[PDB]
Structures are given as C-alpha cells and as structure tokens.
C-alpha cells in the first residue's frame, strides 16, 4: 500500500497534500542549505528565522482560460510583501534562499491541457522598444501573476515587456525551457507540480529587492479545453515556501 502519486510536504506551520502529483523535482540535484563558513563573506551573525520565514505562502490564484498564454512571477519578489519573509527582506541588505515551489491545478477526467511549471534562474527580460529596458512596474507583479502575450507587443518609446509567450520574453525557444528545473501539469495524469530550488547566483548572498535570481513561469503548451457541461473556471494556484532563509546587514526598513 504505497503510491508515488500521493505526497505531503511540511514546512513551518504549513502542510501541503496531493493525491495526483508526479515526482518532485529537486533543483540541480542540490537541496537547499545554509551558507557554509568557507563560502561566506558577510562577517556579521546572520539571522535564520526558520519556521517564521520558511513556510508555505499561497499567492493569488489565476484563471486558466482556453486562450491564456501564460504567467510568470519573479521569485525573491513574489513574496516581498508576505509575512515575516517580507519583513526580513525590507530590514536586511543581504538575503539568501531556496524554495519549495508548489503549483496546484485540478480539473477532471473530462478536461484537458498541459501546463509547464518551470523555475528559470536569472530570467532577464526584453523590451518592446529596442532602445529601453522594461520598468519595475512592468516586470514585477508581487504575489499576483504577470501575463504573457498571445502575440507581439508594439514598440513606441515605452518601457514595456516583450511578453510574447513563444519567446518567454527572453528571445529563446519557449520549448527549450526544459533545461531548467521543471515539471508538466498534464490534467490528464497530473494535478500539481512540485519543484525544490536551491539557492542560485554568482555570489553567496544578494539584495532581495534589487535582484530576482529566479523566476517561476507557468505556460500552457496544450490549451485548456472541455465541453458544454464541464465547469469553466479552472484556476491555477501557486504556493511557494522559502528554505534555509538567511539575512545579513540589518538596518532600517524600507525598500528604498
């Protein structure tokens, strides 16, 4: 009596369950862990809130419509206003984390579709107008998804994002996003997607506002579809849990 379809994850005062998941993808094989003394530079005693910061934060849901192109969330950012994890970002110059990203989305034996849940590290995005760079307000959606576009975005001295889905706003083949830790929610067999991401970056720690080392993207390759009778509102919810969060350089708050 054991099925890999079932699973349960506990982190802090929060637990998640699935009865129809795939496996669980673990980063680049690496499992999150605090910073070793032989790999640090910040000389001050770090802070490890632990249970207070490394828990499951459930973001705003999103509707998957027969035509939705996709969504995305910058990671250090998507939680910058949730609980003490956010409070620690505001109060500290330096931060370091990994996350257990859990994307939920149930349908029924009668619906169909296939999402691609992926964690893209260092997802720098392009601009609609080749002479500028997207603005913060256009890139960051903090706890509320950012939508990809079904077709190109016009130029014209604006600071918009080239949200064309098949280009992942990075100017690359969207179908090659698999070289990144990922899973596929194929309503037919799947029902949720879990990915544990280890801290990634070219430095031991970084400022959590000024930089977004990972970007979560959900992108349907096979559009939702059902039949008259089957329910029409199929939401997609994202829950993310920080792991081994450390903060250095304490000072006055504010994300200025």
């Amino acid at each position: 009596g054991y099925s890999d379809r079932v699973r349960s994850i506990t982190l802090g005062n929060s637990t998640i369950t699935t009865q129809e998941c795939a496996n669980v993808v673990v980063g680049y094989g690496v499992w999150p862990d605090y910073l070793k003394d032989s790999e640090a530079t910040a000389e001050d005693q770090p802070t490890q809130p632990d249970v207070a910061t490394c828990r499951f934060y459930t973001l705003d849901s999103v509707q998957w419509q027969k035509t939705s192109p996709g969504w995305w969330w910058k990671l250090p950012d998507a939680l910058s206003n949730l609980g003490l994890f956010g409070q620690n970002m505001q109060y500290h110059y330096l931060g370091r984390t990994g996350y257990t990203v859990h994307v939920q989305c149930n349908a029924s034996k009668f619906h169909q579709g296939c999402l691609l849940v992926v964690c893209v590290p260092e997802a720098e995005m392009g601009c609609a107008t080749l002479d500028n760079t997207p603005s913060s307000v256009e890139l960051l959606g903090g706890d509320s998804a950012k939508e990809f576009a079904d077709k190109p975005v016009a130029s014209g001295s604006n600071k918009l994002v080239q949200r064309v889905v098949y280009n992942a706003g990075m100017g690359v083949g969207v179908g090659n996003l698999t070289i990144f830790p990922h899973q596929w929610i194929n309503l037919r067999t799947n029902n949720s997607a879990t990915i544990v991401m280890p801290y990634t970056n070219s430095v031991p720690m970084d400022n959590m506002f000024r930089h977004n080392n990972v970007t979560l993207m959900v992108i349907p390759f096979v559009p939702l579809d059902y039949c008259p009778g089957s329910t029409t509102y199929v939401p997609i919810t994202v829950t993310i849990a920080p792991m081994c969060a450390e903060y250095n350089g304490l000072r006055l708050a504010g994300h200025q």
């Binding site: 890999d4 379809r5 795939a22 496996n23 669980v24 993808v25 980063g27 094989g29 070289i179």
Partner: protein, 55 residues
C-alpha cells in the same frame, strides 16, 4: 620538473609551465568528466527505468 600526459588518439607529450601565474597555463582540454543526472533526472525519488513512472 616537467609533466607528461597522454595525447588524443584512437603516446604522450611533455609540458613545463614557464609562468608564475596559473592563469598563464594552457587550456584544460582533457577534462572528460560527465554527470548528466543534475539535468536529466533531477527527481527526488529514484525512477527505475523498467518500472511505471506512476502507479
């Protein structure tokens, strides 16, 4: 003190570093390590090929 490695084939060669900085050394063209697992197969629960991926 020189070193002596193997050349590429289907024999050896001698090397003596002449500079005080490792940056000056020739390329490391013979590191044939390989670890696909990190990318293909980063699953937490080992998946046995002959078995069903779901049950």
């Amino acid at each position: 003190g020189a070193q002596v490695s193997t050349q590429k084939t289907g024999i050896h060669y001698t090397n003596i570093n002449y500079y005080k900085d490792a940056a000056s050394n020739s390329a490391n063209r013979q590191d044939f390590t390989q670890d696909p697992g990190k990318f293909t197969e980063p699953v937490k629960d080992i998946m046995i090929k002959s078995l069903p991926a779901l049950n």
